[PDB]
Design a protein around this ligand. Structure first.
Ligand SMILES: *[C@@H]1O[C@H](CO)[C@@H](O[C@@H]2O[C@H](CO)[C@@H](O[C@@H]3O[C@H](CO[C@H]4O[C@H](CO[C@H]5O[C@H](CO)[C@@H](O)[C@H](O)[C@@H]5O)[C@@H](O)[C@H](O[C@H]5O[C@H](CO)[C@@H](O)[C@H](O)[C@@H]5O)[C@@H]4O)[C@@H](O)[C@H](O[C@H]4O[C@H](CO)[C@@H](O)[C@H](O)[C@@H]4O)[C@@H]3O)[C@H](O)[C@H]2NC(C)=O)[C@H](O)[C@H]1NC(C)=O
Ligand SMILES: *[C@@H]1O[C@H](CO)[C@@H](O[C@@H]2O[C@H](CO)[C@@H](O[C@@H]3O[C@H](CO)[C@@H](O)[C@H](O)[C@@H]3O)[C@H](O)[C@H]2NC(C)=O)[C@H](O)[C@H]1NC(C)=O
Ligand SMILES: *[C@@H]1O[C@H](CO)[C@@H](O[C@@H]2O[C@H](CO)[C@@H](O[C@@H]3O[C@H](CO)[C@@H](O)[C@H](O)[C@@H]3O)[C@H](O)[C@H]2NC(C)=O)[C@H](O)[C@H]1NC(C)=O
Ligand SMILES: *[C@@H]1O[C@H](CO)[C@@H](O[C@@H]2O[C@H](CO)[C@@H](O[C@@H]3O[C@H](CO)[C@@H](O)[C@H](O)[C@@H]3O)[C@H](O)[C@H]2NC(C)=O)[C@H](O)[C@H]1NC(C)=O
Ligand SMILES: *[C@@H]1O[C@H](CO)[C@@H](O)[C@H](O)[C@H]1NC(C)=O
Ligand SMILES: *[C@@H]1O[C@H](CO)[C@@H](O)[C@H](O)[C@H]1NC(C)=O
Ligand SMILES: *[C@@H]1O[C@H](CO)[C@@H](O)[C@H](O)[C@H]1NC(C)=O
Lengths: 96, 194, 40, 129, 205, 48, 129
């Protein structure tokens, strides 16, 4: 009846956090390019059979308005918009 | 009921008391689990022991249970004033339900209003002889020159109370000199002249 | 009350699809009690 | 059955103690000059840091078995005051960590001590023979 | 850990049906069973059945197999680990052997051999099966509390809207030879509510 | 990445039916201002 | 006591043999387009390389226990010619490594051999039963 601690490795324990997410697009997105795709240059091919596990008895609290994957997406899109026009022809000797 | 307990059992304060819980082989106690409940009349019951072994959450260690092959027992050590109540047992399993018992009363040993003026305009007259704060719960009420008397009920302070009423007519209000409520021995007497 | 189109901030354009998702880190270390001791 | 990754996240600790080899499986791993390369790389190293952070603790503790384990540290009642059949059949791992989050670091100190102490003690038994 | 609250006491004539509700608060409604147990003053305490909200798993007794129907709503969460819900139980072939008190009860655990075992209970609803009709209470001030003389559906008694709670002694009623109950209790404002009659009366003493 | 599987969900609060996934569905980065285009339709009743 | 990280760096080998679980604890882990990101990243990977370099040797040797360990390799006198109570009570770890730096690689060869040899030998005992 005297209890002892016992270590467990692999417990469904998570906490809300923010990391660097990456992209993923089909193999066809990498196909349709004459340097024409504005992003897919270095995107990971998506898993052919995505898997969605339903977590029964689980009730998690969401908050769309203070979610960070949005900030990552937008600032990344901004940076991609930027970077796609650096090596392109500059019209400085215009404005005549 | 098919599950039979001890009709009554007693014990003195600071002592122990065992309550039995027996029945046929189909209900007790081979391949069966036993649970106990503290059930105050008029209030919600409380789980004490579950799985004929293990005390409910928040229960003091003063209780203990034990199941044999034919019957189960609940030993309550160090009796308290608030333990004088009814204790039921149930026999159950994982699939089937509960079969309650007959009940065991545990005994811990070693321890007038006049009719209003609005009622006289109805008109009727009923005098109210209320009883409170007595132990043990066994009293007798007599009337002296519509008789009703309740049974002794345990209060929220571990004491007993009751109440007896007598209905009288308005003609007898100015025709009788006085009336008495005897309670065994105290006695209260009213003179109905306003 | 009258309602008029708005915008300006385009993060909304993404909140319209990232309203049903959220990120979580995994911390798989959990200790629990049980009447078990490893011998010496 | 195989409920999959994090299948038993809403289940009792006793029912989720069966699926510890699944959450451990998918815990490590299931390009020109760009910005996604680093986007994936810094995440691909954080994966390793988050894995070995756990593994070094699991190693400096008495149990490199990496599944389940018992320890010679008495469960200090002051931590929970709850019952064996009232947590393993009536509480979820998340809820449980929610209770014990306060004392987690303390427990880690005690495990590291007990383990270093056991190993130092076993060398003395091995040296006399 | 939770809090079980039930609907009110009703007078329903035999034969007719009745539906008792049991609203919850303070825990995952779907994580534990809901048992229904009655107590009538002649047979004794009696279990009738239980239900599992998450799944929809029932198990009535052979006696109530043929005139009872349990129903369960859905869970509205409040936090990640608590919610609110409600459970109903409908009786149909009302007999005189169906008068007394009726309690809903919360399960104990989630797995094992004692998962449905009633642990947490409600306040219990008083059901009265009689062909006699409802009569409201005739409250009277007590010459130096209040006096409930004649009623018949169970009486509540507060003070100054529930302010003067200390020193209050309310006593049980008495069963007259007419079937009526009568109890007594002792800015003075005793509030006597009588929901079967749908009458709330506040009296000054 | 946890994905709420509730048909009527205003984005804030507990989600009764949650599932999990590794990568979200195909989210097209459409740049518009007043009207959202080629987006994900709601389920049953329109969503606010 | 807890003298902290590298507390017993000037202490005798016997007194520093008590603080092996502390130096192992702090041996692994206690941002826009820039030059510091890589500045930290290449260091954050060198940490891992320097850790696993040790761990693979500790694994291919007989002892994955990661604290202290004994081995079935006779201490070749030619290496030191010093005494048990004259090193564990009269010499510091740094000084000791300063003596044995010459033969360290040799010892590693012998440990790898002894361990592969033991494991091959134990499979033959396990196969007859
Ligand atoms: C999600 O969350 C919830 C909440 O945490 C959690 O739910 C719990 O899960 C456990 C495990 O499944 C449940 O506990 C079990 O309950 C069993 C009781 O049901 C049995 O008996 C029922 C009635 O039997 C009577 O009537 C039938 C005919 O009606 C008759 O044959 C009988 O003789 C008897 O008269 C019956 O309804 C029920 O049927 C269900 O299950 C069968 C298969 O098992 C299925 O075919 C049916 O369709 C129906 O789904 C079942 O037959 C109980 O028996 C069981 O006991 C086992 O364990 C003990 C050890 O303790 C063993 O000794 C014993 O032999 C049994 O093996 C166990 O107690 C619990 O009630 C759930 N609900 C809660 C906690 O609220 C979920 O699991 C979570 N899920 C996930 C994925 O996370
Ligand atoms: C982990 O430990 C912390 C203390 O380090 C615990 O925090 C304490 O929690 C209690 C509630 O259980 C707080 O009491 C609160 O008081 C306010 C004041 O009115 C009241 O409004 C709240 O309703 C609540 O009763 C207490 O203040 C708080 N301690 C501090 C310093 O803030 C925490 O509960 C522990 N975690 C767990 C899971 O037990
Ligand atoms: C404009 O909106 C319409 C919506 O009806 C788009 O056509 C519909 O596209 C959706 C997916 O975007 C299709 O739904 C999918 O169908 C598959 C069929 O197997 C199902 O398994 C998936 O779960 C998913 O629900 C839908 O079928 C399709 N409608 C029809 C009639 O074909 C259309 O593509 C949109 N145009 C754009 C965005 O330019
Ligand atoms: C590790 O092994 C090396 C040999 O591979 C040892 O180096 C040798 O050390 C001795 C001194 O103990 C050197 O002798 C020296 O001779 C010069 C010549 O006059 C003299 O001036 C010095 O005072 C000293 O006596 C010897 O030359 C040197 N070997 C070589 C090839 O240079 C080294 O000592 C070993 N390490 C330890 C900690 O023992
Ligand atoms: C846990 O339950 C056991 C039943 O065996 C009981 O003896 C003990 O007092 C309980 N512990 C607590 C903290 O309630
Ligand atoms: C563990 O419980 C004991 C009870 O004897 C208490 O004195 C002690 O402070 C607790 N230890 C810690 C580290 O919390
Ligand atoms: C170990 O000492 C022996 C003495 O018998 C010597 O012959 C041998 O060379 C030494 N081994 C090595 C590898 O230095």
């Amino acid at each position: 009846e005297n209890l002892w601690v016992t270590v467990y490795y692999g417990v469904p324990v998570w906490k809300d956090a923010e990391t660097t997410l990456f992209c993923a697009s089909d193999a066809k997105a990498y196909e349709t390019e004459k340097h024409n795709v504005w992003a897919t240059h270095a995107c990971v091919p998506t898993d052919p059979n995505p898997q969605e596990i339903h977590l029964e008895n689980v009730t998690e609290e969401f908050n769309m308005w203070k979610n960070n994957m949005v900030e990552q997406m937008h600032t990344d899109i901004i940076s991609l918009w930027c970077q796609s026009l650096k090596p392109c022809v500059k019209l400085t000797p215009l404005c005549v | 009921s098919v599950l039979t307990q001890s009709a009554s059992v007693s014990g003195s304060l600071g002592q122990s008391v065992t309550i039995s819980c027996t029945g046929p082989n189909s209900v007790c106690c081979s391949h069966k689990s036993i649970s106990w409940y503290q059930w105050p009349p008029g209030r919600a019951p409380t789980l004490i022991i579950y799985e004929d072994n293990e005390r409910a959450p928040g229960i003091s260690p003063r209780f203990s249970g034990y199941k044999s092959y034919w019957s189960a027992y609940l030993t309550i050590s160090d009796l308290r004033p608030e333990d004088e109540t009814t204790y039921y047992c149930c026999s159950y399993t994982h699939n089937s339900g509960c079969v309650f018992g007959t009940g065991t009363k545990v005994s811990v040993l070693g321890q007038l209003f006049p009719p209003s003026s609005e009622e006289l305009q109805a008109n009727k007259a009923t005098l109210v002889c209320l009883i409170s704060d007595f132990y043990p719960g066994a009293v007798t009420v007599a009337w002296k020159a519509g008789v009703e008397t309740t049974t002794p009920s345990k209060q929220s302070n571990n004491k007993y109370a009751a109440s007896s009423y007598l209905s009288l007519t308005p003609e007898q209000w100015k025709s009788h000199r006085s009336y008495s409520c005897q309670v065994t021995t105290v006695e209260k007497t009213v003179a109905p002249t306003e | 009350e009258t309602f008029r189109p708005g915008g300006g901030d385009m993060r909304d354009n993404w909140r319209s699809e990232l309203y049903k998702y959220k990120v979580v880190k995994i911390e798989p270390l959990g200790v629990a009690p049980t009447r078990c001791k490893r011998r010496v | 059955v195989f409920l999959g990754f994090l299948g038993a996240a809403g289940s009792t600790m006793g029912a989720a103690s069966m699926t510890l080899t699944v959450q451990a499986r998918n815990l490590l791993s299931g390009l020109k000059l760009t910005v996604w390369g680093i986007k994936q790389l810094q995440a691909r190293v954080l994966a390793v840091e988050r894995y070995l952070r756990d593994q070094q603790l699991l190693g400096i503790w008495g149990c490199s078995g990496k599944l389940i384990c018992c320890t010679n540290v008495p469960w200090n009642s002051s931590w929970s005051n709850r019952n064996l059949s009232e947590i393993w059949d009536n509480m979820t791992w998340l809820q449980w960590d929610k209770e014990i989050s306060n004392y987690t670091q303390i427990i880690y100190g005690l495990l590291e001590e007990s383990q270093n102490q056991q190993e130092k003690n076993e060398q003395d038994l091995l040296a006399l023979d | 850990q939770g809090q079980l609250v039930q609907s009110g006491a009703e007078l329903k004539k035999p034969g007719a049906s009745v539906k008792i509700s049991c609203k919850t608060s303070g825990y995952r409604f779907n994580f534990y069973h809901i048992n229904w147990i009655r107590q009538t003053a002649g047979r004794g305490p009696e279990w009738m059945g239980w239900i599992s909200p998450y799944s929809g798993d029932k198990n009535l007794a052979p006696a109530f197999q043929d005139r009872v129907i349990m129903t369960t709503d859905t869970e509205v969460p409040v936090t990640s680990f608590t919610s609110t819900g409600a459970a109903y139980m409908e009786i149909r072939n009302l007999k005189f052997d169906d008068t007394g008190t009726y309690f809903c009860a919360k399960g104990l655990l989630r797995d094992g051999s004692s998962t449905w075992l009633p642990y947490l209970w409600g306040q219990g609803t008083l059901l009265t099966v009689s062909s006699a009709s409802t009569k409201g209470p005739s409250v009277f001030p007590l010459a130096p509390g209040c006096l409930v003389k004649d009623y018949f559906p169970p009486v509540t008694v507060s003070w100054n809207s529930g302010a003067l709670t200390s020193g209050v002694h309310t006593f049980p009623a008495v069963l007259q030879s007419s079937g009526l109950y009568s109890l007594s209790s002792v800015t003075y404002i005793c509030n006597v509510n009588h929901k079967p009659s749908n009458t709330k009366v506040d009296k000054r003493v | 990445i946890l994905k709420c599987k509730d048909k009527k969900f205003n984005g804030t609060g507990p989600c009764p039916s949650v599932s999990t996934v590794q990568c979200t569905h195909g989210i097209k980065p459409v740049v518009s201002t007043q009207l959202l285009l080629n987006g994900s339709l709601a389920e049953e009743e329109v969503m606010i």
